[PDB]
Amino acid sequence: MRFKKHVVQHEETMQAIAQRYYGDVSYWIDLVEHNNLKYPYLVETDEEKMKDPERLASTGDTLIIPIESDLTDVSAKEINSRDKDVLVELALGRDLNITADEKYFNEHGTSDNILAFSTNGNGDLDTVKGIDNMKQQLQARLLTPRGSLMLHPNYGSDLHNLFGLNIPEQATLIEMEVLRTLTSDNRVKSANLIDWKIQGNVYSGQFSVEIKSVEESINFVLGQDEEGIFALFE
């Protein structure tokens, strides 16, 4: 359950609150009954509240409005930018950093024993969040051979076998495999080719990845509020 809570403003009235929330002043008596207020409902200052602290409320006190509120179906324009950042951080998840030392496992991408855990410098395990978490997950999926991970036959990629000839056919095979790998992730909305080239022994390419927008992540997390898990099991 969840209800709205209203702070008493300067020289406010119960009719104004009822109009603001319920859309009609008629509910001010219901608001009085629910909050158990005496006739001077909103006193000028705390000196008057001292006369009867139980039954009276002064400026700065909090009233309860029993309207069933729900975090979903809330306009994202009202949400603060920091709140949006935290929401997308929750949506993309938090995971222990393993892709530290980018140079090492970029030099030995196809081999095992390439990545390892790391510390955050404060004595605790390192963590990657949001875009860093997505980077880590996508790098791990691309580097992982398909079928090598226990309990997950489909997770990984076939790039270890696509060290073929230097022709456009193998380049297309690589591109298709990479697109399959990126599309395998549920968070990746779509991926597509940008540009590629061949320099004899070396193949080079780059891709564009469009993660789920801020609106979709906000909606997902705020809908998760009904369950309270706030965790990812994709």
Next chain:
Amino acid sequence: KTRKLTNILSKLIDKTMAGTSKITDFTPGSASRSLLEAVSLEIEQFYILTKENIDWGIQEGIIEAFDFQKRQSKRAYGDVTIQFYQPLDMRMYIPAGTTFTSTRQEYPQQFETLVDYYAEPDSTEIVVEVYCKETGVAGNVPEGTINTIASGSSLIRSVNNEYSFNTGTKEESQEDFKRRFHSFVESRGRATNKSVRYGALQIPDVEGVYVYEETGHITVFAHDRNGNLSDTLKEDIIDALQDYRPSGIMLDVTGVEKEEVNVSATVTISNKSRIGDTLQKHIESVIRSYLNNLKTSDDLIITDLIQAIMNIDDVLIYDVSFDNLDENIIVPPQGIIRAGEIKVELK
């Protein structure tokens, strides 16, 4: 019974139209309509105020005249002392809502100040008033409970509540208020068997009273916890009942017809090693308590006594028998049973 906002506004508009035709625009946003709506809202609020006052008066106005106060639910409140390491170098400010707590699991109640406070530079320790955030007796913390401030400056040496909080109260229900008032009204009664019995029972040392009525005479049977009626207590009862008895009627006081029952019991026991004086005295004490617990009109059922003696222990106590107790000793309403000489034989 009462008008309402729409009705008041409609009648105001109708009366305004009747009074003059110079105004005809009563649409939303009109200055005249806004004025009439404000007046109508004020009048509706006054109507609600009158309704509240009358509702209070219906259920408290009459009884309040007889010095009877209904117990309202209150937040526990009281004074706390804050000590500073030294006289204050500047004017310190404690805003309203500053929280005070206690470092115990026994008392998770939170207290807060409902008003702003100021401590002068010359002061070294200032007392403030804090209110419990929850209504009820839960805020009635004992002395030396409140010992922390959640937003205080480091200049504080210590925090302490000098006295226990006792102002927290639960709301008294209306039926209990009516019951107290009716009990008082009944107590105002006089010159009846009920009123005489009541007035006798208000005496401190009287435990039970039976009033027997005869034409032209009243006799009162009274007893203490021991089933006795001392001469001093008899005189006290007489003096108290001088005010109660009817005019032209004779009243007498007498002691309850006490009947001391001597019980000699043979108790068969399983564990022969546990036979000893202590178990004997325990059984004797149980029997004595059973016999002395009986009220004025309670008859001594022997089967219930056997049940109690066997329920002392379900396996150890094997069997019981009595030579004195052959059949249930019936007694009248004015004859109480009490414990006499008791003996227990272990077999």
Next chain:
Amino acid sequence: MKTRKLTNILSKLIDKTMAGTSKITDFTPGSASRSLLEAVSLEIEQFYILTKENIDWGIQEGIIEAFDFQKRQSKRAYGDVTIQFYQPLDMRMYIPAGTTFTSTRQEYPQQFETLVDYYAEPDSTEIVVEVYCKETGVAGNVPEGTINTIASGSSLIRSVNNEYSFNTGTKEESQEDFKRRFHSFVESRGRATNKSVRYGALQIPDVEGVYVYEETGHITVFAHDRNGNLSDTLKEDIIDALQDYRPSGIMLDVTGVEKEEVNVSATVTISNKSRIGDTLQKHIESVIRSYLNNLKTSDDLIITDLIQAIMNIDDVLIYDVSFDNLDENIIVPPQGIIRAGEIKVELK
């Protein structure tokens, strides 16, 4: 509430308006400002009036609530019915509760039933059984001779008849009687007095009136129902109620009033002889029954008072009245009462 009136409020508003500005000086009839202030002041006047009325109502409600002195509701009529057999019984027949009694007289189609079982002994010729009207209110106050049917269908029944008109049925209590009994309550908070004994006897709703006859060391409580009877159950209930109120050590006895049943046969002459019929006879009989049953305890019957009561029905239509069974006034003692018996009227 100080009970202000409209003119003073309007005058005060206009005076303050004039004081606050010299520009506004037109408060004639038909002006906007006068109309607005008149409307406001009228609403205030109505608020004050309704507040006063609501306070009066709330005082009554608080009186009711504080002492739990609930107002008495409408009472269902009840009475007794006589039943006769062909010959004295041999079987001890059983009549369970709920045995319905009805009347063929369509003018009074109300139904009655027994709330308690009854037994008729062998070698018994008739039985009296108490019955209660199914419907509440005055509708159960049928006249004598109305009930003449029993729905049990037993063949042993010869005839059914209620020997007296029922009167116990009444509507909801009036305000004046409620206030009267509240005064009796206040008076009888002192338990042992005569007024308190009278209240305790009247504490039972079914009791109509009580006369406390007092002697040295003895009390006699003459009590009666609306019909002038005092059943054993009601006597026991009165005694139980009086246990709390009666003085201790003084003998008390409860007995029924010395009820006297009057039979009236009236010969009446009518100026307009076309008006003769069953309606006029029944109306006059109803008036006579109402007059006789409205008599309280210690009320002496006066023949001239009955004469004027009959003649005031219609002084022109009714020409003369003569009684075939009454010739002199009846003196009722303090402990007696008159109730209607068999009422008959002959139209000439």
Next chain:
Amino acid sequence: LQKHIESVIRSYLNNLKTSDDLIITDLIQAIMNIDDVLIYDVSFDNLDENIIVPPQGIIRAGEIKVELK
């Protein structure tokens, strides 16, 4: 209530093992512990003294009857 008390008595009698002596007071407390308040007094119309069972004997319930007053 009659059937419940009869069932309790039957259970108590049938639960007796070999060489278990019937004691009337034990049966009294077993009956009274059903409800000490509701039950006021108990009296037996066919038993007056305890029954001694030898090692090779046993007691079993016969006809159980209860009268409510």
Next chain:
Amino acid sequence: ANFLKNLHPLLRRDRNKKDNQDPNFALIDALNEEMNQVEKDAIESKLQSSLKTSTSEYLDKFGDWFGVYRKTDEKDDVYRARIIKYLLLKRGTNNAIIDAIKDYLGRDDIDVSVYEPFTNIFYTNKSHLNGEDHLMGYYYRFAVINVSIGDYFPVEIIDVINEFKPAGVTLYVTYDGASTIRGGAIIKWD
């Protein structure tokens, strides 16, 4: 008194500086005065709904409900005290009769007592033969009382006692003329 708060927001709440005779402020303040006065009256009206704090007309309503009527020039405090006392009257004993006698009369210092002749019934054993006791009969009988009054009384005081005495007790009244003698009652010859 929320008239200014719930007023149309564009309207001025304060007397304008440009004109000391601002009719808008005059009209608003006039209406606000009436609104505040009605609020004050409504707040004060709570006193009339309670028997403890009621006054003239509503107190008369209360006393009419309780069956006690205001006397000539009887003020509210004594009237409510009389109502409360009338509700709480003890009845059926010697003390109640004495209190009623001393209340109906204008003073309390008068000597009043209730004599119970059944205390002086001649019993065979305990009663002295030539003592104060009398043989049992009509007067020396239970359910009989003789009230001694040491002051002039109206005959209606008997009816007053009839209101308080228990039912079934015969009443007698004795007038003690010694208590009402002017000055010292001892007569001198020398």
